[PDB]
Nucleic acid binder design. Structure first.
Length: 23
RNA sequence: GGUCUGGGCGCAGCGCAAGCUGACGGUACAGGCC
């Protein structure tokens, strides 16, 4: 995986854990 | 209403050289199934 692919894939886990954390 | 993918090009940090990276840009953009 490239920096973007991971970065892109990460922001999903990122924001998602974001939602859970926030919620 | 939900879910999945990804290429930069940027600012920074380091080296006889050769290279790489930031739960950062970027909750972007570009495209997906009912």
């Amino acid at each position: 995986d490239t920096r973007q692919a991971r970065r892109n894939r990460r922001r999903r886990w990122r924001e998602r854990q974001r939602a859970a954390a926030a919620r």
